[PDB]
Design a protein around this nucleic acid. Structure first.
Ligand SMILES: Nc1nc2c(ncn2[C@H]2C[C@H](O)[C@@H](COP(=O)(O)NP(=O)(O)OP(=O)(O)O)O2)c(=O)[nH]1
Ligand SMILES: [Mg+2]
Ligand SMILES: [Mg+2]
Length: 425
DNA sequence: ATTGTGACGCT
């Protein structure tokens, strides 16, 4: 009753950019705007692999991970932008820099946790307290939430249903109680409207946001009304939402763990989790997962918004599939040097921008026919931002995989260099 | 012959 804490302390938002790499290319190339288009990596093998799709193109069934030739079968007027290639590999620099544009704007409003190239969490609890004090009890106008959806409303066209849901939400608000969680979420959603307006005005990119009380609900909410919309998921809307929410839709249950939850417990939806005691979940899925699951199916999650705007690692990766697998010593050296050269450029820029230095170089390889994605992961010291030195050290650290008596065997299907263990500089 | 990243957990 009174002592059952509800995980309504925080206001957390998740902002994710809509079809981000396509928007970056559409800003640079006006001819792609308001068109079915996608961004691919490479072009020789089946026209390249798609990693980003505009919503127009999605209406035709185009998705990420499709080959571009297959996508063209679904969508014959599809436009394609290609990722830059450098030293024979995909170069994602332009999007990392567009990302930084967006992150720098988000940082003005609150402390953010970069969750990926195109998305960040925001802890808005302090900002909402401030804005609540400034309103001095003034009610909240639907003008202030022009793109906000309220999940589970209305109850009892799209813009119409959205505005109906927003009016039902706003007429039920107790605006006098500075401590009502629902009010706090509302004020958060006003601030997130302002943040998304600033992002679009200062970059031309559009995004969606989830506003809720924790990261998992914010992230789930963010997807509910993409594109170019934001969704408030209240604590009170969790039971209905989760009663038909497949377990795999929750961040981190989309894989092996989620499948075991489904299979062992004999359930399909998030809501059904509430019928198990914490100990039952801890027995089946370990003590941590169990605690996390017991709280999560009630809408409660405690993972903090970490103050971390920058990646913790900087890495360069390239597959060598099938008959392009590296089979000679010269080949492994030339590609370790290409990877090391890109890594060096990125690290030198990181040092000058962010006043820090990586201290550990990780080399990962896959050998042909291996089942695993990574066959060997070995670390060594990183003492200089010198590509020739890094590549030589990667070779020294992996050379004892070669079973040849000039040749390389088994042939390498992946090289991966990664700088980690950063330190102030 | 999705590929290229990046976080975090387990032991
Ligand atoms: N290299 C590479 N880049 C990828 C991959 N997957 C995604 N990206 C890149 C391209 C993506 O633009 C970007 C962000 O990924 P999302 O937020 O998951 N997708 P988006 O923003 O496109 O659409 P939505 O509106 O649904 O959020 O990361 C991949 O497998 N490989
Ligand atoms: Mg996105
Ligand atoms: Mg994303």
């Amino acid at each position: 009753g009174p002592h059952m804490a509800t995980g309504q302390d925080r206001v957390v938002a998740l902002v994710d950019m809509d079809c981000f790499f396509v928007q970056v290319e559409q800003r640079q190339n006006p001819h792609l705007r308001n068109k079915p288009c996608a961004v691919v990596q490479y072009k020789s093998w089946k026209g390249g692999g798609i990693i980003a799709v505009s919503y127009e193109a999605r209406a035709f069934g185009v998705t990420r991970s499709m080959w571009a030739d297959d996508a063209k079968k679904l969508c014959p007027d599809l436009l394609l932008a290609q990722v830059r290639e450098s030293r024979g590999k995909a170069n994602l620099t332009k999007y990392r820099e567009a990302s930084v544009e967006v992150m720098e704007i988000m940082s003005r409003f609150a402390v953010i946790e970069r969750a990926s190239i195109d998305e960040a969490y925001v802890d808005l609890t302090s900002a909402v307290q401030e804005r609540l004090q400034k309103l001095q009890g003034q009610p909240i106008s639907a003008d202030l939430l022009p793109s906000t959806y309220i999940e589970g409303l209305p109850q009892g066209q799209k813009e119409g249903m959205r505005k109906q849901g927003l009016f039902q939400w706003l007429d039920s608000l107790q605006i006098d109680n500075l401590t009502s969680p629902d009010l706090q979420l509302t004020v958060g959603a006003v601030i997130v409207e302002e943040m998304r307006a600033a992002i679009e005005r200062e970059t031309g990119f559009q995004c969606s946001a989830g506003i809720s009380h924790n990261k998992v609900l914010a992230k789930l909410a963010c997807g509910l009304n993409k594109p170019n919309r934001q969704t408030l998921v209240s604590h009170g809307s969790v039971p209905q939402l989760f009663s038909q929410m497949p377990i795999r839709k929750i961040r981190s249950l989309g894989g092996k763990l989620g499948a075991s939850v489904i299979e062992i417990l004999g359930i399909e939806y998030m809501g059904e989790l509430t019928q198990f005691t914490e100990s039952q979940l801890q027995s089946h899925f370990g003590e941590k997962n169990g605690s996390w699951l017991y709280a999560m199916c009630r809408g409660i999650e405690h993972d903090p918004v970490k103050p971390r705007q920058l990646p913790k690692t900087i890495g360069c990766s390239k597959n060598f599939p099938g008959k392009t697998a590296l089979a000679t010593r010269e080949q492994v050296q030339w590609w370790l040097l290409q990877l090391a050269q890109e890594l060096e450029e990125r690290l030198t820029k990181d040092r000058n921008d962010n006043d820090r230095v990586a201290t550990q170089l990780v080399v990962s390889i896959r050998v042909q026919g291996d089942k695993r994605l990574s066959s060997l992961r070995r670390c060594c010291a990183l003492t200089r931002y010198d590509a020739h030195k890094m590549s030589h050290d990667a070779f020294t650290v992996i050379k004892n995989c070669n079973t040849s008596g000039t040749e390389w065997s088994p042939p390498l299907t992946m090289l991966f260099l990664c700088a980690t263990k950063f330190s102030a500089s």
